From a paper:
GIPC1 (GAIP interacting protein, C-terminus 1) and its two paralogs GIPC2 and GIPC3 are universal adaptor proteins that bind and regulate vesicular trafficking of many transmembrane proteins. GIPCs contribute to the endocytosis process by tethering the cargo proteins on endocytic vesicles to the motor protein myosin VI. GIPCs contain a central PDZ (PSD-95, Dlg and ZO-1) domain that mediates the interaction with the C-terminal PDZ-binding motif (PBM) in cargo proteins. The transmembrane receptor PlexinD1 contains a C-terminal ‘SEA’ motif that constitutes a PBM and interacts with GIPC1.
Numbering used by the authors:
A (entry chain B): 1053 to 1096
B (entry chain A): 238 to 312
The structure:
């Protein structure tokens, strides 16, 4: 249920929350997005 | 001017790209846009995306708004 998160919501959370699991789950989700981007951007 | 329409469409799409990833490049926005100007429903569009951009796992509210941006070229 993290895919449906808006960017600025991932961003405000990583930059303000305290939840150890949530913080780590937002990083790896924010990462996953710019990950697949970097992948597609490489070919194109 | 039917080219100002394409440009507005793409521009409205990478606008949605900045809301989803904070990123913004026209090559991606155009890649997506040119996967919809042939289809008729957001499911036909969803299939075209999955070929090139399958690994993105785009949220449904996002690929709607993009399809919403493409269908606006009808008027």
């Amino acid at each position: 249920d993290l895919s449906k998160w808006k960017y600025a919501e991932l961003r405000d959370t990583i930059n303000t929350s305290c939840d150890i699991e949530l913080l780590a789950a937002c990083r790896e989700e924010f990462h996953r997005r710019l990950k697949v981007y970097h992948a597609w951007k490489s070919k194109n | 001017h039917m080219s100002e329409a394409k440009a507005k469409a793409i521009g409205k799409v990478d606008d949605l790209l900045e809301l989803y990833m904070g990123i913004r490049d026209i090559d991606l926005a155009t890649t997506m846009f040119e996967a919809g100007k042939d289809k008729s429903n957001p499911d036909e569009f969803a299939v075209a995306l999955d070929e090139t951009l399958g690994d993105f796992a785009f949220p449904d509210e996002f690929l709607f708004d993009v399809w919403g941006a493409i269908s606006d070229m009808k008027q």
